[PDB]
Write a protein that binds this DNA or RNA. Sequence first.
RNA 1: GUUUCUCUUCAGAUCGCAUAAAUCUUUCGCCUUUUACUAAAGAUUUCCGUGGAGAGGAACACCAAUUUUUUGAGCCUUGCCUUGGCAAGGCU
Lengths: 73, 83, 94, 111
Amino acid sequence: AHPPELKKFMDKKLSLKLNGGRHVQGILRGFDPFMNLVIDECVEMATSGQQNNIGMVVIRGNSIIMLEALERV
Amino acid sequence: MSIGVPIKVLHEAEGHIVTCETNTGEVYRGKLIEAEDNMNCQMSNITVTYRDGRVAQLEQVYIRGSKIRFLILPDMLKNAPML
Amino acid sequence: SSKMLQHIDYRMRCILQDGRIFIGTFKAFDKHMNLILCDCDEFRKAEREEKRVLGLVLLRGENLVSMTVEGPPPKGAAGGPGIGRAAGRGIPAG
Amino acid sequence: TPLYTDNTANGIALLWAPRPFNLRSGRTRRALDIPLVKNWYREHCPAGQPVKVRVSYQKLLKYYVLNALKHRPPKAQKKRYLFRSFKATKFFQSTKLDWVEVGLQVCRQGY
RNA sequence: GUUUCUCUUCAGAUCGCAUAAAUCUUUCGCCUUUUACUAAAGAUUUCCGUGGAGAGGAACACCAAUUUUUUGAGCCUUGCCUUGGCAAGGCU
């Protein structure tokens, strides 16, 4: 079927690497057929390593180019 | 439906060791686990080469389909009953 | 289809979107122009020039620009009842 | 399409019919070769029948076993058709006659 | 093209979902003698039929909305590289 087999990764702690050289790290709970993610406890990794905290975020599917686990399935 | 010969060879590739290069220029080298019909791969136990030289090891990774621009499938597959 | 199918099993040269070149022996293609190249070289350009080797390369269709040929491929009626034998002639009388 | 049709009840029952009846197609045999009474004496008939027939059953099995034991395959002997060789010759002719007419003729000839 | 008839060749096959007789060598039995026998084995042939192949005759005849194909394009600055360009980096 069309959904990504992302079911494994849920509630484990992800890093993402986003289009345009951006990085965010997250505990995950969402996916839909386009891979639109809903990330929780989401940190923004700025260029300089000055880190922000931000709340729950949606991501557009096409913006992702990798999706990595910081703590295992 | 006519999902042709290449994606079947991708499913055939699973459980081996494949190399996989993304738009940005990062080169991954990892053991495959599953691959979907739009080429979303999961990959395990990777040694990644960065664009500028550096190596790193990784636990597990999932690589969006449209973001790839080759895989290096393991040569023994040339015999496979898809071909 | 039919124009592409003529090329199969030859040694094909592909030019990717980024400017790279692959040269490979060609055995798969698909409605999105995915490819499988085999026994394959990665090749880049006195202006310096270089030649790397790759195996069994699977090309996601989006990248492809063009492909070209330059190689030849990495590739009665039954016996009848007659018998001959040595013979003399023998003249008849008269 | 319906779960069953009127032929379904009958048609299943053919699957365990004896050897000539359980098939849709076969090859024709000679009237000589079909052993019409064979199935009876191959089964141990109920003993309340008189002594006389019991031994008659048993002695039918004896000739059955001996034939199938001493059977040897055919020797691949070359075909040679007798009556064809006859009717190829000017001395023979052919026609279509009642069996009772021919029977009288063979007895008249043999006499 | 379907039937038919004839010929040639090979048969490994339940060539047969059926089942005959003959010869020889032995073991037997009634037995003056011999056929005709008996009933088991083995080697053998004959006969009733069969299949495969080939030859020839005859008779009737569809979608531009993220996952590929209707595009994030395109533009600059640094180092090297003799030049060409490459490694990038930064932009809108």
